[PDB]
C-alpha cells in the first residue's frame, strides 16, 4: 500500500515567464487521490514556484548543504528550504555526484542534516555505463544505498530514486524488466538490512528515461513505486507521467 | 575607479532576519561615491531583490557555464537576469577550498556571465602554506591570468582580493600588506591590459573588514573598496558603507 510518487527535477531549466507557463499547467491538471507529485525548481526558484503551484503540489530543492549556516559561499541549507516553503530535497543526483563530484561521504551527511531538519529526502543511486558492463551493479548501488542508510533514523520521511545512469545519454537503454530487476534488489537490501516494515513501506523510485509511451509498463512493475521524471517534467507529457496508475 | 563596497552573506539568513537586515540597509543613506552590491543566499536572491531599494545591487553568489542544461542543484546567469541580480560572485575562496572549483571551470564561468550581461566580482588568494613558501605572487598571478584569459571587456569586472592565509589561521593581514598585494595584483594587469584598464579595473579587499578597520584599508593607495564577509549581516556593513567620507 506505498503511495504512487511522481518527482519532476526540472535541473537548471526555466524562467519566471516559462516556469510560470509550466506551473499554470500543472495546476489545471487533475491529480488522482492516490498519487503524491513534488517538483524540484532551480534553486533560483524555490521560492517562485511555491507561491504560484497549488498546495496540492509539493515542492523540493535540487540540492543542500549539510550544515544549518556558515561560510560557504553558493550554498544553502535545509533551513532555508524549510524557510521557503519547500518540503523535500533531492540529494545524491547523478550530477552532482559525477559531474561536481560530491562524494558518498558527503551525501549521507546532507541525508542526515536535512533529516535532522524535518526536510524530507529524495536520495538518488545509481551506477554507471562502466559500472554496469562490468556486471557491478548491486555492488555500487548497495554501497551508495548503505551510505544513505547509516545516516537514515525515520524512513517514513525518505523516497529512494533508482537513476540508471549507464543508459542515460552513453548509448544503451533500460527496459521495464531491468529496472524491476534493480527495484526488487534494492527492496531486498533493505529487508536484509534495515527492517521488514522499512522494505515495505520505502518508496523506491525510477529515476531512468521515461516518456508517456513508457510510463504504463513502468509503473505496474511490483517494486516500481513512482518516477524521478527528467526533462519531461518540463512538458505536458509529465501529467501522463502523474497519470501512470490510471 | 569608483568605490566599490560588496556584501557577502554567505550561507547565512531566513526572510525574517535578511527582511530586517534589508530595513536597516533600505534606511542607510548611500553615499553617490559608493557601489553598493549585496550577495544573498541562492534562495534568496528573488526575495532580496523584491525587498531591497534600486540603489543597492543584487549579487548571485555563484553560478554555471551554460544558460540551461542538466546540471542538478545549479543556476545560470540567466536566471541570475531574470531574478533582476546584476553581478555574480565567482571564484570565491570558499568555491575552490571546500567545492574543489578549478581555475578552468571559474574561468569559463566568467566567459559566460559576461556574455550574458552580468557584471563579475572575481576572486582570488593563495593561502598560509603558499604565502609561508614565499609563492604568493606565483599563485595569485595564475589565478589572476584564468580570469583575464576570459575577459575581453574588463568595463563589467571587479577583482577581490582575499588573504586565505589570515582566515582562521592564527595570521591577520595589515593594511600595508593588503595595500602590497593590491599593487602587484594592478601591475601584473597594467602591463597585461591597459593603463586604462590597470587604471579603470577596480581591485577591492576580501579580508576581515570592520568598522574599526575600513577607513585605514579605504585609504590604501590601490585599495578600491571592499567583500565583506560577517559584517554584511549586521548594522556594521553601513559603517563600512561609509568607509570614504
Known sequence: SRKFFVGGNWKMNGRKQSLG???????????????????????????????KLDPKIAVAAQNCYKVTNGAFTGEISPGMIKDCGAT??????????????????????????????????????????????????????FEQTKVIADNVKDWSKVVLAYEPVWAIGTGKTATPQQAQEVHEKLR?????????????????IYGGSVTGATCK?????????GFL????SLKPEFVDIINAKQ
Open 21 to 51: 507557463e509550466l506551473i499554470g499547467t500543472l495546476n489545471a491538471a487533475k491529480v488522482p487521490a492516490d498519487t503524491e507529485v513534488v517538483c524540484a525548481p532551480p534553486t533560483a526558484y524555490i521560492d517562485f514556484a511555491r507561491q
Open 88 to 141: 523535500w530535497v533531492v540529494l545524491g543526483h547523478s550530477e552532482r555526484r559525477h559531474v561536481f563530484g560530491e562524494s558518498d561521504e558527503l551525501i549521507g551527511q546532507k541525508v542526515a542534516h536535512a533529516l535532522a531538519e524535518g526536510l524530507g529526502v529524495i536520495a538518488c543511486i545509481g551506477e554507471k555505463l562502466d559500472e554496469r558492463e562490468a556486471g557491478i551493479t548491486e555492488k555500487v548501488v
Open 188 to 204: 531486498g537490501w533493505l529487508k536484509s538490512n534495515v527492517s521488514d516494515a522499512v522494505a515495505q513501506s520505502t518508496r523506491i
Open 217 to 225: 509498463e513502468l509503473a505496474s512493475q511490483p517494486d516500481v513505486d
Open 229 to 232: 521524471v527528467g526533462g519531461a
